[PDB]
Amino acid sequence: MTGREILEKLERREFTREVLKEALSINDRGFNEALFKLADEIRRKYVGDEVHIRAIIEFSNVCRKNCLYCGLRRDNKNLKRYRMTPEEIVERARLAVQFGAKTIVLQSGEDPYXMPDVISDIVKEIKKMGVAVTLSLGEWPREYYEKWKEAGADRYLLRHETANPVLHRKLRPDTSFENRLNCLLTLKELGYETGAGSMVGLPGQTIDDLVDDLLFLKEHDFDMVGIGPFIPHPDTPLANEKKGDFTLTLKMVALTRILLPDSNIPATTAMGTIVPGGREITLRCGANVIMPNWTPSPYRQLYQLYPGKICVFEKDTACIPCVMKMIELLGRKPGRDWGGRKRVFET
């Protein structure tokens, strides 16, 4: 259909595969700008002008898995590995809460050392501070997820990466889409606010695959959706592949907001890495969350999922203040509470 008719169907919520495919395939500037405006307006209406700050501590870059896209993959010998101590992680979290963070995100490689009991201990200590805790630790047994929920964790981020099971298995050779989905379903059953999401522009990924990602997210009605471009890392098998396209990734964020109007959607660091000011653009095209880096030196520079990451040369405490300034210059407001999903039940 024409751009105008696709927009009209999106506005009427005729979210057919055909409508989504055409939205992603049309490259017209006028169409794209209208799509972004629609997503921005839906964001404003459903989740308001508050931008929720989640302070992320990347506490270990040790990983047992070998994902082909990721700089932390176990086969990468050209990376200094680190582990923050439990005391360092708790005190770093406390500093974030002192700086006004209402959610602490603990993220790592799949590092066996902490699992499950050290994480449980850390979660309990951080929960005493009266903030939300979000974990992003990869795939672990149900029993671990259960222990972490009992310890007080509120949310879990586990991007589905790609909903194409063949592509998923090739890129993530230790595991599968079936396992990734079962993990996400387990997290939901246990009562976590659950986050999924995907990379855009993976080698071999098609527009139809992106449509499938959108339909998968809509199907499962995730609380959070993290989306960013694939960024090749020189010490991985995908070193020589093309980076994901910023505008296409932005369209995926916009469509995610249109499909899941009451969800929490970050403006990811990868978006700010491939285009200067990319996070700010993304916050104006459907996103309502930002995750300032709170990993301390000397470790911040060693958590290299992809190269060139912004935030690496700034001081340990710079990023929360940075995003507060950002929020103000965008004409937005910081989140007032923990920024949990506020469902708007509809038809």
Ligand X SMILES: C[C@H](CCC(=O)NCCC[N+](C)(C)C[C@H](O)CS(=O)(=O)O)[C@H]1CC[C@H]2[C@@H]3[C@H](O)C[C@@H]4C[C@H](O)CC[C@]4(C)[C@H]3C[C@H](O)[C@]12C
Give the nearest distance from C-beta 312 to ligand SF4 in angstroms. Answer: 17
Q: Does 210 bind ligand SF4 (CB under 6 A)?
A: no
Distance CA 161, CA 325 (A): 31
Give φ, ψ of 322 to 5 degrees: -55, -50
Positions 295 through 324 that interact with ligand [S] (CB under 6 A):
311, 314, 318-319, 322
Q: Could you say whether residue 67 binds ligand SF4 (CB under 6 A)?
A: yes
- Give the residues across from 136 on adjacent strands: 107
136 versus 263: smaller Cβ distance to ligand SAH = 136
Site string for ligand X, 61-100 (x = CB under 6 A): -------------------------------------xxx
Residue ranges for the known binding site for [2Fe-2S] cluster are 311, 319, 322
One-letter-per-residue 3-state SS of 214-276: HHHHHHHCCCEEEEEECCCCCCCCCCCCCCCCHHHHHHHHHHHHHHCCCCECECCHHHHHHCC
CA dist list (Å): 62 to 84, 205, 247, 253 = 11, 28, 32, 30
Which residue lies nearer to ligand SF4 by CB, 9 or 83?
Answer: 83
- Which string of x and - marks every residue 13-52 that binds ligand X (by CB under 6 A)? ----------------x--xx--xx--x------------
x/- letters, 110..149, toward Cl ion (CB under 5 A): ------------------------x---------------
Residues making up the binding site for [4Fe-4S] cluster: 63, 67, 70
Q: How far is the CB of 70 from ligand SAH (least distance, A)?
A: 4
161/212 with CB nearer ligand SF4 = 161
Are the C-beta atoms of residues 115 and 63 closer than 8 Å to each other? no
Q: Is 183 in the site for ligand SF4 (CB under 6 A)?
A: no
**Closest CA relative to residue 56, chosen from 106, 100, 1:** 106
Sequence-ordered list of residues with C-beta below 8 angstroms from that of 276, at least 6 positions apart, any chain: none
* Binding-site member from 22, 58, 110, 193 for ligand SF4 (CB under 6 A): 110
Neighbours of 307 (CB within 10 A): 14
Beta-sheet strands, E only, within the chain: 50-60, 103-108, 132-136, 155-157, 193-200, 224-229, 289-290, 333-334
Rg of the chain over CA atoms, in angstroms? 19
- Which residues of the chain form contacts with ligand SF4 (CB under 6 A)? 63, 65, 67, 70, 72-73, 109-110, 138, 305
- Which residues of the chain form contacts with ligand X (CB under 6 A)? 29, 32-33, 36-37, 40, 98-100, 246-247, 250, 275, 281, 284-285, 321, 324-325, 328, 334
